C-alpha cells in the first residue's frame, strides 16, 4: 500500500492525476490541492505505470511514491 504525491498541476489538474491513474487502474483515495495532489497507489497497481504516467502528465521531478502502510 503506498502514496504518490505530485506537485506541478494547478487548481483543477488534481482530478487529472487520479484520473489517468483512475483510467488505467483503480486508485484508492486521491486528495486535491492547489497544485499538489496526493493519490493512494497500492503495491499491486500500475505503480511503475504511474511513476511513468503521472510524471509525463506533469513533469519528471515532482512525483514521488511514499508508502503509507
Swiss-Prot record:
The organism's place on the tree of life at top rank: Bacteria
Coiled coil: none
Location relative to the cell: Cytoplasm
Subunit structure: An in vitro complex of CheW/CheA(L)/CheA(S) in a 1:1:1 ratio increases the autophosphorylation of CheA and is required for the binding of CheY, the phosphorylation substrate. This complex accounts for 10% of the total number of molecules.
Entry text on domains: May have three functional domains: one for interaction with CheB and CheY, a second for regulating phosphorylation and controlling the stability of the protein, and a third for receiving input signals regulating CheA activity.
Function: Involved in the transmission of sensory signals from the chemoreceptors to the flagellar motors. CheA is autophosphorylated; it can transfer its phosphate group to either CheB or CheY.
Protein name: Chemotaxis protein CheA
Organism: Escherichia coli (strain K12)
Covered range of the whole protein: 159 to 227 of 654
Amino acid at each position: 500500500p503506498r502514496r504518490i504525491i505530485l506537485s506541478r498541476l494547478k487548481a483543477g489538474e488534481v482530478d487529472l492525476l487520479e484520473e489517468e491513474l483512475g483510467h488505467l487502474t483503480t486508485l484508492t483515495d486521491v486528495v486535491k490541492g492547489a497544485d499538489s495532489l496526493s493519490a493512494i497507489l497500492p503495491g499491486d497497481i500500475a505503480e511503475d505505470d504511474i511513476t511513468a504516467v503521472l510524471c509525463f502528465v506533469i513533469e519528471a521531478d515532482q512525483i514521488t511514491f511514499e508508502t503509507v502502510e
